[PDB]
């Protein structure tokens, strides 16, 4: 995030700082929903960091005030940004795994958002069957 | 006569009615007339019911569960609000207009106060007579306040407790009995400095015995 | 009709919609009003449909680009 790397790179001495990653969302959603949205946002940021920034602001109206980090959006706008970020993550995973987005199932999409992977260099253990 | 029932029978009847309703709903679901019930989801219940799908789009899930909670809450509220409007309605006409069943017997309490020169006590007595719908009259004379109140038994019991405990020179009920019909009109006051005018006003409705008993009580208080 | 879930599936049944009533200047035109170049194409059909008669002059007598949203 642009608010963190610059801050730590120009910090000439070690120190400790506090942030509130849930800027004001807690006023309308429970902390469970806030954490889920935050982890989805960070997954998208780790994936692309460029298209994710674009999805963060859907319109020039959404302005990030200096008081906090994430842009302030309406509830439905938050829903749309969340679904767009989910589509981003699924499409990018498909790009690196040659798998269709529709090919993934609900549990599989949850696993990908969390960070599960599937690999098998030695499949000959199929001899169990 | 109406018959009560023991707490055991009350519990059994309520349990039977609830079980009947639950079986009715379940068999309605069996026959397809009713959709299968949806899980009741709250904020704590969210990640347990919709855990595999809240990671897809958490804000939509939050909106859905809050909509369900608000739907339940608003379903509860409508009936309550309608029946509270029912409260206003009755309270002004069916929950506060009783009259104590004064049809076959009118309880008449005639008291004789010594000092009633304060208009605030007379205004409070008139407000208590008008709020409880109790008829009667009040006669004023030289160190004499003959207040007769005829009405229901509960209204007379409220008026005696208001005049003996809630109102302060001493007030004592001179004649507390029952009558066949009503004799005095609305709650009004009549100032009579002479005893003959008060006696004629009491004998105009046939209640000169109360004024005679008040005069005898005043004579017995002034003698001893 | 309407919509409801009977057993395992949600059936939504909309009834048969009423057709558009013919006006005082709109009716099923027969094949006797077609010209000699168009009478040979309507072989075996003594009359025409309602949509064919409501846009007969706009498609046969007019050479403009017709867009029939039938």
Strands side by side in the biggest sheet of chain B: 4-1-3-2-5
Number of strands of chain A: 0
Task: State the end-to-end distance of chain A.
Answer: 49 Å
Q: What's the overall geometry of chain A? A: globular
How many extended strands of chain B? Answer: 5
> What's the number of helices of chain A?
5
Order of helices and strands of chain A: HHHHH
Could you say which structural class the secondary elements and strand pairing of chain A correspond to?
mainly alpha
Overall geometry of chain B: elongated
Q: Tell me what portion of residues of chain A adopts beta-strand conformation.
A: under 5%
Multimer state:
part of a larger assembly
* Helix count from the secondary structure assignment of chain B: 8
PDB class: splicing
Keywords: spliceosome, splicing
Entry title: Cryo-EM structure of the cross-exon pre-B+ATP complex
Chain A: Pre-mRNA-processing-splicing factor 8
Describe this structure in words.
Helix content of chain A is 49%, strand content 0%. With 129 residues, chain A is mainly alpha-helical. Chain A is globular. Chain A starts with a helix and ends in a 15-residue tail after the last helix. By secondary structure, chain B is an alpha+beta fold. Chain C has 2 helices and 2 strands, in the order ββαα. Chain B: Plays a role in pre-mRNA splicing as component of the U4/U6-U5 tri-snRNP complex that is involved in spliceosome assembly, and as component of the precatalytic spliceosome (spliceosome B complex).
């Amino acid at each position: 995030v642009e608010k963190f790397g610059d801050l730590i790179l120009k910090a000439t001495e070690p120190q400790m700082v506090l942030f509130n990653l849930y800027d004001d969302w807690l006023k309308t959603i429970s902390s469970y929903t806030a954490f889920s949205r935050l982890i989805l946002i960070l997954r998208a940021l780790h994936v692309n960091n460029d298209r994710a920034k674009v999805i963060l602001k859907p319109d020039k109206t959404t302005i990030t005030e200096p008081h906090h980090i994430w842009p302030t959006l309406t509830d439905e706008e938050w829903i749309k940004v969340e679904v767009q970020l989910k589509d981003l993550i699924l499409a990018d995973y498909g790009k690196k795994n040659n798998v269709n987005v529709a090919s993934l199932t609900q549990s599989e999409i949850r696993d990908i958002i969390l960070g599960m992977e599937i690999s098998a260099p030695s499949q000959q253990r199929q001899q169990i069957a | 006569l109406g018959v009560y029932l023991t707490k055991k029978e009350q519990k059994k009847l309520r349990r039977q009615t609830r079980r009947e309703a639950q079986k009715e709903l379940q068999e309605k679901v069996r026959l397809g007339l009713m959709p299968p019930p949806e899980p009741k989801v709250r904020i704590s219940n969210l990640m347990r019911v919709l855990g595999t799908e809240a990671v897809q789009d958490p804000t939509k899930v939050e909106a859905h569960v809050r909509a369900q909670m608000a739907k339940r809450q608003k379903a509860h509220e409508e009936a309550n609000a309608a029946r509270k409007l029912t409260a206003e309605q009755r309270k002004v006409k069916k929950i506060k207009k009783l009259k104590e069943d004064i049809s076959q017997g009118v309880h008449i309490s005639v008291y004789r106060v010594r000092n009633l020169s304060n208009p605030a006590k007379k205004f409070k007595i008139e407000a208590n007579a008008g709020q409880l719908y109790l008829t009667g009259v009040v006669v004023l004379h030289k160190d004499v306040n003959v207040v007769v109140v005829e009405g229901g038994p509960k209204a007379q019991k409220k008026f005696k407790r208001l005049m003996l405990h809630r109102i302060k020179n001493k007030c004592v009920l001179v004649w507390e009995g029952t009558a066949k019909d009503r004799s005095f009109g609305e709650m009004k006051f009549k100032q009579c400095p002479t005893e003959n005018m008060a006696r004629e006003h009491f004998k105009k409705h046939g209640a000169e015995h109360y004024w005679d008993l008040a005069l005898s009580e005043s004579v017995l208080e002034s003698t001893d | 009709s309407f919509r409801r879930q009977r057993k395992g599936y949600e059936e939504v049944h909309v009834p048969a919609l009423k057709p558009k009533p013919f006006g005082s200047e709109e009716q099923l035109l027969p094949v006797e009003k077609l010209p000699k170049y168009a009478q040979a194409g309507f072989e075996g059909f003594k009359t025409l449909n309602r949509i064919q008669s409501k846009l007969y002059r706009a498609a046969l007598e007019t050479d403009e680009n017709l867009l029939l949203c039938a």
